[PDB]
Write a protein that binds this ligand. Structure first.
Ligand code: FXR
Ligand code: FXR
Ligand code: FXR
Lengths: 495, 495
């Protein structure tokens, strides 16, 4: 089956209200930039962002011109003429609306509280989807806390129920309405809901892992924001998952969550595969179409893993626009993020940037030796490794933020489509390198193992292996007379 | 209030059936050896052992002569003439009956399994108590496994209900009927039920910790069977409590259960006090009135921490009686166990034994240089440090196995009674030494702390400390926007 290619289309309310396809100073990325060829290379477009209002219903920004919004959506749905598989999802949430201190966070928490709130919220999602012509619902709550997770589960299940209903009602079995979420791509936020991944993912068609922003100016050491594999020379991080409410023993937590660890794309994926009931076909790897830039960096390792002087405040404090060649930074008033489109133009614009390659992380980076700058980003080369990863691990596909940040020819999107689908591409010899893999073992990736059946009344020594009720168990100490499962003395090590 | 002093009177069935007080070759320790003085030094005698029959009721061994049994028990209860505080408990279980592999083990499993089985078993206990004139019920199931624990507790609760009713029905307000159990004194067995210690001890007057047999010939290195504190030079053990069914986080398991650790009496006591709802005044420290002997030991440290050639299976599987001077070893066909009485005569008898002292563990040991022998045991000296520990830790008192192993003068009993109740004994400057204490910190022994109150809406840095809902909390990583108790980021550290 065809791998998912899920690209966000983000447009702020002011750009909707003043939508034009002929003035890049008003709308930098009009829907017209999404050509038929590009429409054939996507499977989903995540239109974004809608919100949840104080009435606890799915809603557009109250400032939205409803006619201008419908017109933007129509331009997106017209693209389905070029691709019968294409879906225009819409996204509820995002960081600004839905983080703990965001403007609407309480409406997310309160919408999922009761069966009545959940039914009201869920019905509003389907009503919105139908009123505007969307093909599915994407929820980007960043992120439900432990006590909110069950309500969030039930809210998803309720949307699932109404979406399947609407599919039968509209006779859409050939392209059924879908439900997805944006999931945390790093252990710290993932720890909030990790223990309930199985029930979170069960009503989803996909969970799109936000496997980017794994580095940034808020950390004191420069790093790759989306390393596939780990680099022993790079910084390592506390494995927050070892503190999630899993109820596991010490040996179980220790062998699932080595700490410190390399905060990589592969870590986030394996961490999802470690839980029982999380199918790899539903995991979608996120990739960034932008880079993050640091100032004040020391040479030696090309700016990698170096101290830096980049502010972490939002918004950017000063007017020091120090990313040389980033005209787009001036428009947006921030030198710390630059679209791939813009970084490509910096590389070919003779500005003093050197493109380097880390063969552990399998990602590019820019070092500005004169100005002491470092940029972590992704490109068509790094997408080669991530695509082969997606194929090797049988993931559902790829997600990226966002369409507007690709270059004018859509090379990043075309690359992703190519690596999955082109007869003229062959990655069978692509060498995935020797970067650090995430080797945690959990209930969802226990190996098949073979051991004598458990004999009741036997006294087992330490390390003995025994087969019992569908698992292979190992003793942690000696003189074991208890049965496996029933006792602190046995470790489940295989199936 | 008086510390408990709980002595086991153990008499096998055949000594009952042939009971006499005029032939130490039939009955080595008849009840007449408990003089009025020694009765005054006891607060409880645990008559042992009764069982649970296949009808899932408390019962004597079927082979018991019931007339002879009533006479032995009447002799023990007559002792109450000399001590109105004295209680003749009876004990259900013991290792032989109730261990995983013991002859009656399934009866213990089945007795507690259902409401009707527990009601029937609890009634049988109170009927046995009243019919024979006992003052309370002590249950030595060694040991219930995790899945069995809730049923065990309900049964203990059910016994508590009947016993409290029976107290009122019998006018025994001044000496209420009591309920105790013998609990594990070592982490391995303790890990079976550790997580439910609170509800296990709640219906009990006392939990009698079997803080002995912590060394023995089943272990590859000779060691002290009842070290008060640890010796860095001694062996260390896997801390099985970190695998108990606690549901705590990795950090919580780690700071509570250092591993490996020194298997000591202090470890067991602190391990009980680490759990919430386990009051120190219900914790009783077991001590041994016998010693454990090893052969094939090497010099260099008086036989301590040496490899050895002692068989570990039971029964002793040879007729080689190598504990020289040990008369009763021959009588009992086992050179691996000697009563304190026998050990003292060996020390008096010129047999080549040197009495040595470990000032870290605060326990004596014998070294036999000629024959390569090592004996771990306890005496009136080690009992000073332990009695002072009992007072300083505000424990309930002391328990011991068993009365028939004291010397004919009752020196061990008298020593215990002296250290608790003699007006002219002063241990205020008894040096408790620099042996290793158990450092684990858990929910029932958190340090009192202060910290600024948690303020919702605040974003906390890593390592920040706040007070909230009665506790002081620390963030384990940075950018924390959630409240303590609602997030994996907050670690309970205090108050
Ligand atoms: C201050 C801060 C602290 C911790 C995490 N933070 C974020 O994780 C974050 C994320 C975004 C963001 O927009 N990521 C792109 C995206 C794509 C699709 C769906 N949802 C989000 C943002 N602007 N600020 C963010 N600040 C923070
Ligand atoms: C083979 C073995 C391995 C590990 C520990 N082992 C014991 O810890 C133990 C303990 C006893 C025992 O009887 N202790 C006396 C007692 C006092 C009060 C209440 N209940 C029992 C026994 N006979 N064999 C025992 N074998 C073992
Ligand atoms: C994913 C992401 C996207 C955009 C901005 N982002 C942040 O601005 C950020 C900031 C922090 C952070 O730690 N900021 C200050 C601080 C340091 C130490 C203790 N307390 C607060 C963090 N951990 N993740 C962060 N992720 C993001």
């Amino acid at each position: 089956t065809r791998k998912a290619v899920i690209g966000y289309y983000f447009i702020p309310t002011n750009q909707i209200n003043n939508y034009t396809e002929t003035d890049t100073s008003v709308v930098p990325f009009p829907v017209s930039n999404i050509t038929p060829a590009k429409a054939k290379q996507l499977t989903h477009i995540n239109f974004s962002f809608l919100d949840i209002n104080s009435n606890l219903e799915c809603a557009w920004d109250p400032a939205t011109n409803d006619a201008k919004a419908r017109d933007v959506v129509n331009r997106l749905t017209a693209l389905k003429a070029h691709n019968p598989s294409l879906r225009i999802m819409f996204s509820i949430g995002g960081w600004y609306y839905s983080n703990d201190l965001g403007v609407s966070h309480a409406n997310y928490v309160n919408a999922v509280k009761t069966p009545a709130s959940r039914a009201k919220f869920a019905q509003s999602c389907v009503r919105i989807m139908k009123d505007y012509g969307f093909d599915g619902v994407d929820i980007d709550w960043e992120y439900p806390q432990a006590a909110e997770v069950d309500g969030f589960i039930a809210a998803l299940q309720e949307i699932r129920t109404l979406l399947n209903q609407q599919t039968i009602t509209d006779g859409r079995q050939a392209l059924p309405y879908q439900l997805t979420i944006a999931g945390a791509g790093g252990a710290f936020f993932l720890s909030r809901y990790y223990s309930k991944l199985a029930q979170i993912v069960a009503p989803l068609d996909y969970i799109n892992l936000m496997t980017y922003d794994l580095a940034g100016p808020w950390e004191k050491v420069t790093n790759h924001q989306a390393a596939l594999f780990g680099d022993a020379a790079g910084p390592t991080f506390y494995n927050a998952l070892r503190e999630a409410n899993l109820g596991w023993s010490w040996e179980e937590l220790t062998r699932a969550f080595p700490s410190p660890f390399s905060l990589t794309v592969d870590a986030a994926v394996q961490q999802h595969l470690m839980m029982e009931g999380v199918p790899s076909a539903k995991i979608v790897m996120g990739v960034p179409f932008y880079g993050r830039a640091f100032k004040g960096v020391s040479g030696g390792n090309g700016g990698q893993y170096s101290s830096h002087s980049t502010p972490g405040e939002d918004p950017y404090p000063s007017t020091d626009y120090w990313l040389v060649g980033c005209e787009e930074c001036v428009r947006d008033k921030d030198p710390r993020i630059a679209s791939y489109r813009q970084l490509e133009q910096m590389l070919q614009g003779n500005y003093g940037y050197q493109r380097l390659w880390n063969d552990k992380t399998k990602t590019p980076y820019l070092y500005h030796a004169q100005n002491g700058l470092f940029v972590t980003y992704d490109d068509a080369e790094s997408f080669k490794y991530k695509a082969k990863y997606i194929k090797q691990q049988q993931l559902g596909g790829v997600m990226f933020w966002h369409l507007g940040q690709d270059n004018r020819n859509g090379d990043l999107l075309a690359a992703l489509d190519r690596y999955f689908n082109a007869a003229d591409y062959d990655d069978s010899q692509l060498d995935m390198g020797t970067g650090l893999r995430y080797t945690g073992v959990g209930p969802g990736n226990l190996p098949i193992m073979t051991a004598p059946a458990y004999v009741p009344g036997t006294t087992y020594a330490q390390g003995a292996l025994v087969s019992y009720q569908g698992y292979v168990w190992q003793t942690k100490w000696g003189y074991i007379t208890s049965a496996p499962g029933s006792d602190s003395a046995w470790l489940k090590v295989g199936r």
